[PDB]
C-alpha cells in the first residue's frame, strides 16, 4: 500500500545552502518530513525522490543549472517552490 504522491511544497533555503540548494532543501525540509505522519499528504512518508526546484525566471531551459531563487527582503533567506514525489505509506 505504498503510494507515490507528487507534492509541491514552498520551502525556504538558508544562505549556507546556496552551494547545494538541492541538498539544502533535502536537509532542511524533506529530511524533517520522512517517517512522520503528514496530514497534508495522507499517510506516513517512507521516502522522497525527484526533488525539482522551480525557477523565478520563466525564460529558462528546463535544465538551467542556475535558477533564480527569490530572496526575502528583510532576511537573507530564499523562498521557493519545489516539486518532489514522496514514497508515502498509507494504511
Amino acid at each position: 500500500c505504498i503510494v507515490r504522491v507528487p507534492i509541491a511544497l514552498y520551502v525556504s533555503l538558508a544562505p549556507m545552502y546556496l552551494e547545494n540548494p538541492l541538498q539544502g532543501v533535502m536537509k532542511q525540509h524533506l529530511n524533517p518530513l520522512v517517517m512522520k505522519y503528514n496530514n497534508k499528504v495522507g499517510g506516513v512518508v517512507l521516502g522522497y525522490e525527484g526533488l525539482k526546484i522551480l525557477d523565478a525566471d520563466p525564460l529558462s531551459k528546463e535544465d538551467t543549472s542556475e535558477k533564480l531563487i527569490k530572496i526575502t527582503p528583510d532576511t537573507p533567506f530564499g523562498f521557493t517552490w519545489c516539486h518532489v514525489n514522496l514514497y508515502v505509506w498509507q494504511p
Binding site: 538558508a14 544562505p15 525564460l59 537573507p76
Partner: protein, 100 residues
C-alpha cells in the same frame, strides 16, 4: 489536486507573460545607487549567515566590507529584478551592470 494545478499553471503563465525576454530590455545598464546599496546589504546579510566565500579575506570582519570586496571583483551571485509600472520585470545579473 486539480484546482491546485490550474492555480499553479495560471501563476506561471502570468509570470512568463510579465517576464520581459533578455534580448529586449530597455533599462539603464548601470547599477544605480539604490541597487548597489541593496546588493551590498543583502550579500552582507548572507555572508553573516555563513554564505559562500569567494573573495579572499584580508582580515575583514565587517560583512559590508566583505560585500564591497565581492562587488569590486563582481563575484556577487545575485540578480536585480527591475519592475516596470505595469508589473513586467527585467532581470539583470550583477555582472551585466556597470557601476559608476
Amino acid at each position: 489536486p486539480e484546482d491546485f494545478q490550474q492555480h499553479e499553471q495560471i501563476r506561471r503563465k502570468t509570470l512568463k507573460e510579465k517576464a520581459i525576454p533578455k534580448d529586449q530590455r530597455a533599462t539603464t545598464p548601470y547599477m544605480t545607487k539604490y541597487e548597489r546599496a541593496r546588493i551590498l546589504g543583502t550579500r552582507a546579510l548572507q555572508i553573516s549567515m555563513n554564505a559562500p566565500v569567494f573573495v579572499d579575506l584580508e582580515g575583514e570582519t565587517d560583512p559590508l566590507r566583505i560585500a564591497m570586496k565581492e562587488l569590486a571583483e563582481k563575484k556577487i551571485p545575485l540578480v536585480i529584478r527591475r519592475y516596470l509600472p505595469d508589473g513586467s520585470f527585467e532581470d539583470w545579473s550583477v555582472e551585466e551592470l556597470i557601476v559608476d
